[PDB]
Design a protein around this nucleic acid. Sequence first.
DNA 1: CTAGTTGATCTCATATCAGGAGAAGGAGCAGAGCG
DNA 2: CGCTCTGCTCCTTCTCCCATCCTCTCGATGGCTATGAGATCAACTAG
RNA 3: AUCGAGAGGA
Lengths: 171, 82, 62, 101, 62, 57
Amino acid sequence: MFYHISLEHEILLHPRYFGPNLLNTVKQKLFTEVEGTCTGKYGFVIAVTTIDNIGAGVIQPGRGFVLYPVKYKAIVFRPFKGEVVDAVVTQVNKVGLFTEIGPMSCFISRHSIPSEMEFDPNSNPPCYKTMDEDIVIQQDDEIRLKIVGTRVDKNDIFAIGSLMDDYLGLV
Amino acid sequence: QANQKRITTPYMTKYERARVLGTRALQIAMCAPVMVELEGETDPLLIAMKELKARKIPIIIRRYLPDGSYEDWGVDELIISD
Amino acid sequence: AIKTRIISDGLKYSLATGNWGDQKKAHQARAGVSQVLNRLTFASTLSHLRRLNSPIGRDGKL
Amino acid sequence: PVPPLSVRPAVVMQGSARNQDDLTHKLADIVKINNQLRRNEQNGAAAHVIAEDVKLLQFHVATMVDNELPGLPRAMQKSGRPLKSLKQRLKGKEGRVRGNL
Amino acid sequence: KHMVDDKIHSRARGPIQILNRQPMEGRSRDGGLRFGEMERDCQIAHGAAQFLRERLFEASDP
Amino acid sequence: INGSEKVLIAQEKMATNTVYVFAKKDSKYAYTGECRSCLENSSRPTSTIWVSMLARG
DNA sequence: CTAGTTGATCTCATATCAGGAGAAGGAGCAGAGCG
DNA sequence: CGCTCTGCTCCTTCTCCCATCCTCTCGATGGCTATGAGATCAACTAG
RNA sequence: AUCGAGAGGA
C-alpha cells in the first residue's frame, strides 16, 4: 500500500565533509542510504519525499565523526493479509504462477488457485485455461489477487497471493 | 530555555578550552577544512589553537544545567582567557 | 607398614616452602619460617643466618 | 546460573594438562551432588539421606557464591587451599571493582 | 643490587591477561603499569575525563 | 632442600611455665595471670591456664 | 540399482597473645496504663 | 490486679575494613574419571 | 602458565 510517513534516522559524518556545504552532504548521504532500501517493519521504501528537520550535529568524543539525526518524509509500500491488489502476470509454470506487484514478485501455487484453471504447457504461451477456455491467464496479463502471506528475506519482502476468493480474476 | 537569556558564564572554562582544542585538532587531523590561514603549521594542535585565537572554530558548546535544560554557546561567543 | 615418605616428605616440604606445619593444614600453618638463604653478599648471608622473627603479624599496628 | 567459559577460563599449563578454574571445580561438585540428589529422590533413599544430600548441595552453592561463611568449613581443593568464590572475586582490593575497574 | 637496567620497562600493546583482557603484571611478563584508584582520583581532580577514559577504558581493555 | 639453600629463622614466643600477670584495659577482668604450661619433653601444645579477677562492677 | 565394508555417533550395561568499630537481635526489666 | 506494651540498657553476635605502586625468587599445581557390543546411518568401494 | 608464599624497592 502506497503511504506517506515521517521517519527518523541518525547518520555519522566524517570531518572531511564539513566544508562550505554541509547540509547538502548530509541530505545526499541520507538519500544514497535509504533510497531503494527495505525494512520488514515499515515495508519497502519506494522513495524519500522531503527532508523535514536536521537536528543538531553532536560531535562524538574520541571520534571525529558527527551524528546528525534526520527526520524525513518518505513513501513506503507494505503488503497486508486480506488486502486485494491488482497485479501483472510475469511467468506461468507447472509449479505455480508468478505475478509482479510493483517491486515484489509473488507466486501462487495451483493448490490455492481454483481447480477450474488447468495447466496448459502444450499451448505456445504457457497459460491457465478453464474447461470452457473463456478466461485466459497468461504472461503479461492483469489479474486481481488477495495477499495472504508476507515473508522478509535479507530485509527484502516477498508476498504470496490467492485467487480463490470470489470476484478475483482477470481484469 | 530562552537563548535571549543564557545564565552561564560568558567565559570559556579551562575544560571547554581543552576539549574544544582537542576535538578541533582531531577534526583537522581527519582532513577537515581549516578556518584560518596557515604559514607552515602541520600539527593539528597548533592549527586548532590558531583557530581558537582567531575565534574561528566551528563548534558549539552545549552546557547542561542541573535542572536538565541546556545553553548553546558558539566558541566565538565565549571569552577566551588562556 | 613403615611408609617412610611421611617423615621425609614432611620435613622436606616444610623446609622447602616455609609453611611450618602439616602439608594438609596449609592455611593453619605459619609461613616465613625456613626462608631462602640470601646469597647476595657475605653480610646478607651472615645476617640472614642470625635473623630473629617476632610473629606478631605485620598487619598489627600496635 | 552456571557462568560461561570466559568467567572461568581453563588455562593450559606448560604441557597439555588443562587446569580448570575454582568456579569450574565448584560447579563440578554442585552438579555431582545435584545428580546424586536427583537419583536419590527418584530411586530408593531414606529421608535422612536426602536431607544430608540437600544440606551438602546447600553448602556447595553457598560456598560457590560466598566461601567465608562463619562457622562452616571452607570449600577445599587440592593442595589444601580454599576455593575463590564469586564473592572473593570482587570483594575488595584486587577484586573486579577496585582491582580491574 | 638495584641497577637501572633491571628496572627500566616500557609497554605499547603487549600481552594481556586471560581472565580480564588487561595488560599483564611485571617487567618479566611484558606487563603494563597499574593506573590505580589514586591515579583515577588525581585525574578526576584534574578534570581530564578523556584521558581518564583512555587510561581506564581504551588503553586497558576495550 | 632440592638444591635450594634454606635458612630457619628463629621464632619468638612467650616463655612457658612462667606466671605472667597482665591487665587488659578493655575486658571483663581487671587482672589476668596466665601461664603457658608445657611439660619438659614436649608432647602436646602449650596448655595456657588463666587465673583472672573480675572487674569491679 | 545392490551389497558390503568402514567409520562416526549414540544407547546401554556391566560393580562396590598486641583488632576495632558500628549495627542488629535478644533478653532482662522497670514501669505505665488499664482492662 | 494481672496482663500488655512498650522502651531502655547490657550483652552478644556478626560483619566490614585495614596506603600506593614496583622488583625478584621459590614451591605446588599433577588430576586423572574406561570399554565394548549393538544399532543406525551415511558414504564410498566394489558389484 | 596459574596460584600462593617469602624477600625486597620508593
